Swiss-Prot record:
Organism: Homo sapiens
Entry protein name: Dual specificity protein phosphatase 19
Tyrosine-protein phosphatase domain span: 7-147
Annotated EC: 3.1.3.16, 3.1.3.48
Positions annotated as active site in the UniProt record: A92 (phosphocysteine intermediate)
Phylogenetic lineage: Eukaryota, Metazoa, Chordata, Craniata, Vertebrata
Section covered of the full-length record: 65 to 205 of 217
Regulation: Phosphatase activity is enhanced by Ca(2+) and Mn(2+).
Family: Belongs to the protein-tyrosine phosphatase family. Non-receptor class dual specificity subfamily.
Listed GO CC annotations: cytoplasm
GO biological process: negative regulation of JNK cascade; positive regulation of JNK cascade; positive regulation of MAPK cascade; regulation of JNK cascade
UniProt keyword list: Acetylation, Hydrolase, Protein phosphatase
């Protein structure tokens, strides 16, 4: 639909979580010092191609989507933005399910923190998160083989 105001969540100094409206808000991308944009929706345009480094990974917000399977490509890119001393916006469409799951899993992977703690960090930053129940269960299981 038509563009609306948005509120991104701060996950790390260098890692933001938000919606496609945030991805399409040049005023706030500027203010937030964004350098990198990770688009994990389906069919959302990258609007400012000369202005940011982009990565698009097509993902469907369905409970049968295996969110874990997209982690390497997402986490690679997130780490690129960090290594460059930039800021990455991770977004999808609503930015409450796919994109939320990616960031929760990124915290679990990068710092070996629990699902419950990663989830709480992300939801405190972005109270609108609400991952689909497939993603939820997938995240609960993630990396349990290393215990």
């Amino acid at each position: 639909g038509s563009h609306m105001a948005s509120q991104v969540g701060v996950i790390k100094p260098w890692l933001l979580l938000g919606s496609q409206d945030a991805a399409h808000d040049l005023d706030t991308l500027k203010k937030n010092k964004v350098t990198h944009i990770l688009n994990v929706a389906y069919g959302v345009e990258n609007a400012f191609l000369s202005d940011f480094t982009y990565k698009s990974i097509s993902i469907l917000d369905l409970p049968e989507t295996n969110i874990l399977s997209y982690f390497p490509e997402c986490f690679e890119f997130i780490e690129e933005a960090k290594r460059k001393d930039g800021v990455v916006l991770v977004h999808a469409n609503a930015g409450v399910s796919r994109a939320a799951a990616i960031v929760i899993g990124f915290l679990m992977n990068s710092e070996q923190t629990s699902f419950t703690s990663a989830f709480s960090l992300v939801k405190n930053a972005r109270p609108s998160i609400c991952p689909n129940s497939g993603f939820m269960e997938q995240l609960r299981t993630y990396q349990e083989g290393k215990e």
